[PDB]
Amino acid sequence: AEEIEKTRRRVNALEYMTIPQLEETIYYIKMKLEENERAEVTRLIKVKNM
Amino acid sequence: EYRTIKEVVGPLMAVEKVSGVKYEELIEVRMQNGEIRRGQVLEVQEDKAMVQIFEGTSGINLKNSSVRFLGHPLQLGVSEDMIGRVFDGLGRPKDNGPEILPEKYLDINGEVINPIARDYPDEFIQTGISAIDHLNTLVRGQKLPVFSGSGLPHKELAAQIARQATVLDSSDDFAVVFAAIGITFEEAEFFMEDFRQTGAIDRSVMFMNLANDPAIERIATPRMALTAAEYLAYEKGMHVLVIMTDMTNYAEALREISAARREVPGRRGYPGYLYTNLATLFERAGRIRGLKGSVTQIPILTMPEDDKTHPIPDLTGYITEGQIILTRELYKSGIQPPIDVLPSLSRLKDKGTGAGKTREDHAATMNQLFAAYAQGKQAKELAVVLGESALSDIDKIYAKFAERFENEYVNQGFYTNRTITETLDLGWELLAMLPRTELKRIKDDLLDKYLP
Amino acid sequence: MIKEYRTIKEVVGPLMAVEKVSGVKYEELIEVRMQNGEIRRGQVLEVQEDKAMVQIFEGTSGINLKNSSVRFLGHPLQLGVSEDMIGRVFDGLGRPKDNGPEILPEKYLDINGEVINPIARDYPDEFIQTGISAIDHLNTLVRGQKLPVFSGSGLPHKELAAQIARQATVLDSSDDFAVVFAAIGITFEEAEFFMEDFRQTGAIDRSVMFMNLANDPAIERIATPRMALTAAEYLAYEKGMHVLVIMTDMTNYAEALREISAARREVPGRRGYPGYLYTNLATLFERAGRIRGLKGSVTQIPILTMPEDDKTHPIPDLTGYITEGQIILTRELYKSGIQPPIDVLPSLSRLKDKGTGAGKTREDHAATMNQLFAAYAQGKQAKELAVVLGESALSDIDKIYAKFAERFENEYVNQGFYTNRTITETLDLGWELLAMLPRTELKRIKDDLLDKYLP
Amino acid sequence: SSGSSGMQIGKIIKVSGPLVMAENMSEASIQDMCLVGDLGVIGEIIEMRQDVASIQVYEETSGIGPGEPVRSTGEALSVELGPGIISQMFDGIQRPLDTFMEVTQSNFLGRGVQLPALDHEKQWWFEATIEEGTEVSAGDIIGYVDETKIIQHKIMVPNGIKGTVQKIESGSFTIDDPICVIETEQGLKELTMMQKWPVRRGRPIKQKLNPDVPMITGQRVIDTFFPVTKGGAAAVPGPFGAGKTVVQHQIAKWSDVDLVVYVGCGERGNEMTDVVNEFPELIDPNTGESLMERTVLIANTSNMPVAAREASIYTGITIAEYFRDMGYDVAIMADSTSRWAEALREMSGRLEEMPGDEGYPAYLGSRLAEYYERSGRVIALGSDQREGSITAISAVSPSGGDISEPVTQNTLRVVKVFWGLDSSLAQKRHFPSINWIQSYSLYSTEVGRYMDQILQQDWSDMVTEGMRILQEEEQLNEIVRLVGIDSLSDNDRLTLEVAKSIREDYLQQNAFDDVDTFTSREKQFNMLKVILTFGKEARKALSLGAYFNEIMEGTVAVRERISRSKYIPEEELAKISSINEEIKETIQLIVS
């Protein structure tokens, strides 16, 4: 019974805490990355104009 | 008649040596081969004028093409004969009927209602949907969007609202203006046929814009619709319900134009002015003090990646008053329509409910059903985590309640028109399976009269 | 002769362009005589042909181009320095703000100063007891060091800065610190906290204050820290004082630079910040330390708030690349009730080696530091590994480290903003916490010290 | 020309959205207003290259082009300050919206329509306070006007004027009529009840003071855990549908301030409509005057001209400063400053400027900083040396609810109070949806002392403990999510129930309940004491060998009694504090 609860804890700790952390930490990074790519390209267009 | 086209760079065109040209003025380019392409002044300056042609600048000979300035913005010829007719995204007839004879032409951008002249939304619009009319009530003159996703039956729900929506105790004073933005041919035919199949065309005006149409015609479509909508409402005294879809397609079109004009990309690639641009549309809804009639808007959009934080649903949410949300959990469970009432909300519902508008038990049962369905849902999410033995006996019931609530109450089918009195009646039946001693939102006076 | 031109070509924001101009030098101080007779000082940013670009400190509000004139003073922005500045309070340009006597300048100084010859430098190694254990032991501040505080909005960095100033002293000496305080775009309450604190301790009579508040023109913030540092270097090297400089908020300074940068339509670096942010910041922070043969010294404690609490932001990242370490405050420790909320792990002092040890603090300073650091990192690791997997999920020796980490934060780091620990107390306290760990785990301390100090 | 000559007339050379370029403007100055085009739409000059001026138009520029005239007014963006301003609903540039509708005979906002902010033909009764032959300067009061039955409109000497009062007398006047003559060094200057002031320039004060006195909002979660002081500033950032409007409306209705300046900055038109209809129907039972008779409303909705958003913010704060100088405690509310910043970004694109953060102009931060620094507790100008305050309540609308965005972060750099609105709380019907874990107030320690002194009880100790319980709750909920609630010790299970009571019986508050909508300071105290008392009495009972399940099941009656204590009338306070004895004795019979 104790082994089940220890295992249950880790299943829950991973399913509710660890994975969702990863899931949109990823989502955050990918959108921050695309945010900057689009920022840099807008910079270079102005620099070409000047 | 200026034969002086200076530059052509992509979609943009510079016309020099002009006079009396205004900002956002509609233009007309006659090409060398007798073709006609309308356009719009983006930036007027000096003798020069930077215009954007709707159809594109392909095949145009600068030397032999002439440009005419029409001395007015993008306008819509309106009439009371528009009801029963199907137009394109620019007001042109597409339903092989007679050319409409406009009472007058109106700037599609319209004018802004003085807030001290603006009349607060009031009175009730029966949609025929229980999940809306009771918990999430559509008030006359309110903007209430549907937040959906790809593959979700928001087109079925749209058509269902379009033909079932009605005002009680009113004859032939209600109308639906349906605006289709950047949708496929087959998806447009679905709407058009269903409209004339149920006869809903006989009280509707349809502005249909396809996906392979110019992006400027796409961003112009809801403006064409709302112009005809306000005309019918404020100048003919009608209760107009405007249904628009897909607003995600609208925003993408705006993002395409924005990039075409070398504009600085805002958050997630969309224009920095997306909020404002959306506001100039959604705020066209409402009521005016001293005027019969109203403009009620239901914008429909798909949330990319089912992300409510995406600019398009997020900025819409900051503008509109409520939101009707469709979830894949309910759609995969065959709930029609798949409306999740928990994240859904209508801010003005109180102004369209209660005795004289609906029955006197509208408010109490709403609070009661919503609070109960919350416990039932959270009883279900407990049974899946800690098993069915972690549920007390009182939580037996809320679980079963929430299931019946979805399969009987929310799920009505895309072709079942429930009157509000039917809806409320069904509401009490579901509360009947709950012990009376736990209905603390509803007072004893209502319990003794309606509870079976 | 007064050089003045009535030929202003264009006015755009803080920038002004003057045409038909002669004999004007780069970085020259200028005065705009507006049509209403109001005087607005400025600075030549760029000179080409008969044209001059100038930045107006007070801005160009309500300026008429035709009826305005620009005077060129024939010298860079200077500060009238004097020992009479002690106890006085000035605004962002060094002008009196406390409504007191007129300062009679001993001499005038280019606020840009001059780079100290690296051979002329005297290596700073004099231990400053701050009273804060998280600093004095683990991130030791020495006299002449640039050691900034990395904070965030809503964090108690002003409390830390004031405590350091109240308790800073060297050992075996009756010396104190002349305090030069620079306020950069900070609010009134942020400023009055320091004002009231300096009065309740009498430090106000040992201090010089340059105040640029949040309602002051943003462009003034560029001159402001150079004013302070020019006052500091003067008092230190020409008046033999040990000067403690405190500048906040350094973030506001950087964002001022970017304003001018953006206005000039300069080629933007990251987040609009110019490509010369590192160099520009360095010319401030490198203005500190000791000089061979001179009795004075400059000790810089800049304060910046990390935007979005992210130290990979240009402002804190570049600062960290310049200054000699940093004291980072985390929001997590602040909520925990830690005073001061110092996170020792990402914190650093690059001048702690030669400042501590036998004759400076104690022979066991370096050893216990490295051992507390190692145990805390391991203990904090175990703490987070027990909050997510439970107390029973962790090794028996690691729970000890977890009990250590908690006790280390609540009893060692957390000491209060009005507590002055002697280095001897701090070190003895450190050994107290090492005692709760087995002797065999203390692998960074040699048996020499373990036998002598470990209880 | 042609034998005649008049004033300078500008000529449009370009129209690009809200940005208009006009040549032949050499006589004009920066920050000066001008009528643009045939229609003569309101515009402000922001840049000047030679005779060509960059103009920022606060109206629609559609149907305007080059060649049309431009006429400078010579003065900056000002507001009209004088009797007739209270209870009025202005636009972004202080044009009376009610008069607008009547003059134009239209329900819609046309353009190029000039309207004086105030009624210049309404007779007011001026009452002289000062005797003739007195030395005056900026700020000094020469007399007052009873604009409302409770608010005296104090006519004070304009800035830049100093001299001797030569002629003064009470009587009926308009705001154009000379009520007083001052003998200055320049000569004889006439003073009217009305004065103008540039909205972008802060109104002069003697000095700023520490905002140490807490404002009574009546909203328990605010007044207790995250208090705002008179002169303080609060940020209210949150996602859509978190009910920021209700929070702001509550602060408007129940704050112990003399005057409210509500600023609808680029938001829903309906919400401005809701104000003008509801506010005059909210009567103070004591004063007998409605909220609208101490409210100045500025409305520039989301679909109104964009540039006017910035103007609405400055119009508001300047009016707030005006009444502040009278010695009044004012509350300035901005809903929302996010749309103000979006207006800045809009122009910045047109000016072809270089962005700093997320497309916003590099000067955004300082724009905000200069705004909130205009608020605070001050000593007003004048020999009177009176004290007035301005309290700023600013809503922020961070995209996606992400508060890492520039406007929120730039605001949190200068203000000391952060009321973080939560969407998940909004869905869970938890109102006000203020995240008690994330939200903070840097006035909590100072208010804590003010409370402890005025109540003569350990209030700051009570707030600290209640808040400790709430944070401990969030730590326990993590564990419950992992191992289940069954594993928690009876002490930790008690903590969840005490915190639950804090959330449900104290933190939650219905703005639409006649009793719950407002909670007095002493009622707040009595409620919190009761809830905390339950925890202490129970926790000491557990040490006496009592179990959680018996204590819990044997307190259904009295825990419940705590739940309705929020609905207990202010007159009948004893019914709340009487629970303390009931709890203690109910616990005792369980211990046996």
DSSP secondary structure, D40-95, as one string: TEEEEEEEEETTEEEEEESS--TT--TT-EEEE-SS-SEEEESTT-TT-EE-TT--
Is B415 at the interface with chain D, CB within 8 A? Answer: no
* The two structure tokens encoding residue D12: 């449009």
Cβ–Cβ under 8 Å, residues D181 and D187: no
Among D172, D142, D147, smallest CA distance to D158 is for D142
Can you tell me which residue has the tokens 């009044």? D328
Residue B355, SS3 per DSSP? strand
Q: Which residues contact D24 (CB under 8 A, 6 or more apart)?
A: D8, D9, D10, D11, D51
Distance from CA of D180 to the nearest CA of A (A): 58
Residue A18 with chain C: CB contacts under 8 Å: 388
Type of residue found at D296: V
Q: Which residues contact B1 (CB under 8 A, 6 or more apart)?
A: B66, B68
The CA distance from D512 to B428, in Å, is: 25
Among C282, C283, C257, smallest CA distance to C269 is for C257
Cβ–Cβ under 8 Å, residues D106 and B290: no
Is C416 at the interface with chain D, CB within 8 A? Answer: no
Distance from CA of B250 to the nearest CA of A (A): 21
Query: Are the Cβ atoms of B118 and D13 closer than 8 angstroms?
Result: no
Residue D399 with chain B: CB contacts under 8 Å: 267, 309, 311, 314-315
Cβ–Cβ under 8 Å, residues C290 and D374: no
State the CB neighbour count (10 A cutoff) for residue D382.
18
The CA distance from B164 to C145, in Å, is: 77
Query: Are the Cβ atoms of D356 and C262 closer than 8 angstroms?
Result: yes
Can you tell me which residue has the tokens 């809830």? D531
The CA distance from D440 to B373, in Å, is: 33
Q: Can you state the angle between helices C250-263 and C314-322, rounded to 10 degrees?
A: 110
Q: Name the percent of chain B in helix, strand, coil, to the closest 5.
A: 35, 25, 40
- Residue of chain C nearest A8, judged by CA positions: C389
Looking at the domain D122-191, which fold is it? OB fold (Dihydrolipoamide Acetyltransferase, E2P) (2.40.50)
Distance from CA of B167 to the nearest CA of A (A): 45
Cβ–Cβ under 8 Å, residues D260 and D53: no
CA distances from B443 to B367, B376, B439, C274, D505 (A): 12, 22, 8, 66, 21
Q: Taking the CA atoms of C368, C370, C372 and C375 in sequence, report the sign of the dihedral they define.
A: negative
Q: Which residues contact B98 (CB under 8 A, 6 or more apart)?
A: none
- State how beta strands B174-183 and B239-245 pair: parallel
**Do C and B make contact, counting contact as 3+ CB pairs within 8 angstroms?**
no
CA distances from D242 to B210, D237, D238, D239, D420 (A): 36, 10, 6, 6, 10
The CA distance from B203 to B84, in Å, is: 6
Q: Which residues contact B160 (CB under 8 A, 6 or more apart)?
A: B128, B129, B337, B414, B415
Exposed/middle/buried for residue D573 (C-beta within 10 Å: 0-12, 13-18, 19+): middle
Q: Left, alpha or beta for D282 (phi > 0: left; psi -120 to 50: alpha)?
A: beta
State the CB neighbour count (10 A cutoff) for residue D289.
16
Query: Are the Cβ atoms of D354 and A46 closer than 8 angstroms?
Result: yes
- Known binding residues of D for ATP are 238-245
Residue D272 with chain B: CB contacts under 8 Å: 115, 118
Per DSSP, what are the bridge partners of residue B241? B176, B296
Is D442-592 in CATH node 1.10.540.10?
no
* The two structure tokens encoding residue C430: 């450190």
Is B384 at the interface with chain D, CB within 8 A? Answer: no
CA distances from C188 to B355, C214, C337, D230 (A): 56, 7, 26, 15
Residue C390 with chain D: CB contacts under 8 Å: 482-483
How was this one solved? X-ray
* The two structure tokens encoding residue D273: 């409509």
Q: Residues D263, D268, D270, CA angle at the centre, nearest 5°?
A: 100
Structural domains in chain C, CATH included, are 1-455 (3.40.50.12240)
Residue D21 with chain B: CB contacts under 8 Å: 45
CA distances from C63 to C13, C263, C321 (A): 11, 17, 41
Is D78-121+192-441 in CATH node 3.40.50.20?
no
Query: Are the Cβ atoms of C62 and D418 closer than 8 angstroms?
Result: no
Distance from CA of D50 to the nearest CA of B (A): 17
The helix (H) or strand (E) run that includes residue B183 is strand B174-183
Query: Are the Cβ atoms of D354 and C265 closer than 8 angstroms?
Result: yes
State the CB neighbour count (10 A cutoff) for residue C202.
9
Judge if the upstream peptide bond of residue C249 is cis by omega within 30 degrees of 0.
yes
Distance from CA of C266 to the nearest CA of A (A): 9
Q: Residues B338, B341, B344, CA angle at the centre, nearest 5°?
A: 105
Exposed/middle/buried for residue C104 (C-beta within 10 Å: 0-12, 13-18, 19+): exposed
Type of residue found at D355: P
Residue D179, SS3 per DSSP? coil
Cβ–Cβ under 8 Å, residues D532 and D466: yes
Query: In this complex, which chains have at least 3 CB pairs below 8 Å with chain A?
Result: B, C, D
CA distances from D329 to B16, D153, D213 (A): 58, 14, 11
Q: Taking the CA atoms of C157, C162, C163 and C167 in sequence, report the sign of the dihedral they define.
A: positive
Residues in chain C: 455
- For B388-422, b/e burial (b = at least 16 CB within 10 A) is eeebeeebebbbebbeebbeebbbbeeeebbebee
* The two structure tokens encoding residue C107: 């001499």
CA distances from C163 to B55, C89, C156, D224, D480 (A): 70, 21, 11, 29, 41
Cβ–Cβ under 8 Å, residues D315 and D93: yes
Residue A5 with chain D: CB contacts under 8 Å: 483
- Residue of chain C nearest D31, judged by CA positions: C62
Query: Are the Cβ atoms of C388 and A17 closer than 8 angstroms?
Result: yes
Query: Are the Cβ atoms of D363 and C218 closer than 8 angstroms?
Result: yes
Cβ–Cβ under 8 Å, residues B200 and B162: yes
Per DSSP, what are the bridge partners of residue B288? B118
The CA distance from D328 to D380, in Å, is: 10
Distance from CA of C327 to the nearest CA of A (A): 27
Can you tell me which residue has the tokens 């000559």? D5
Q: How far is CA D161 from the centre of its chain?
A: 31
Query: Are the Cβ atoms of D363 and C13 closer than 8 angstroms?
Result: yes
Is C65 at the interface with chain D, CB within 8 A? Answer: yes
The CA distance from C49 to C40, in Å, is: 24
The CA distance from B325 to B305, in Å, is: 14
The CA distance from B439 to B154, in Å, is: 34
Q: Which of D399, D424, D553 to mutate to test the interface with B (most CBs of B within 10 A)?
A: D399
State the CB neighbour count (10 A cutoff) for residue C282.
17
- State how beta strands D69-72 and D188-191 pair: unpaired
State the CB neighbour count (10 A cutoff) for residue D416.
24
Query: In this complex, which chains have at least 3 CB pairs below 8 Å with chain D?
Result: A, B, C
Per-domain residue ranges of chain D? 1-77, 78-121+192-441, 122-191, 442-592
Q: Name the percent of chain C in helix, strand, coil, to the closest 5.
A: 35, 25, 40
The CA distance from B121 to B143, in Å, is: 10
Is C419 at the interface with chain D, CB within 8 A? Answer: no
Is B352 at the interface with chain D, CB within 8 A? Answer: no
Can you tell me which residue has the tokens 């639409």? D512
Going by the DSSP 8-state scheme, the letter that residue C138 receives in this structure is I
Can you tell me which residue has the tokens 């507790």? D377
Per DSSP, what are the bridge partners of residue D10? D70
The CA distance from C30 to C35, in Å, is: 16
Among C134, C198, C201, C192, smallest CA distance to C340 is for C134
Q: CB-CB: which of B45, B267, B311 is closest to D14?
A: B45
Is B73 at the interface with chain D, CB within 8 A? Answer: yes
Is A12 at the interface with chain D, CB within 8 A? Answer: yes
Can you tell me which residue has the tokens 């508050």? D509
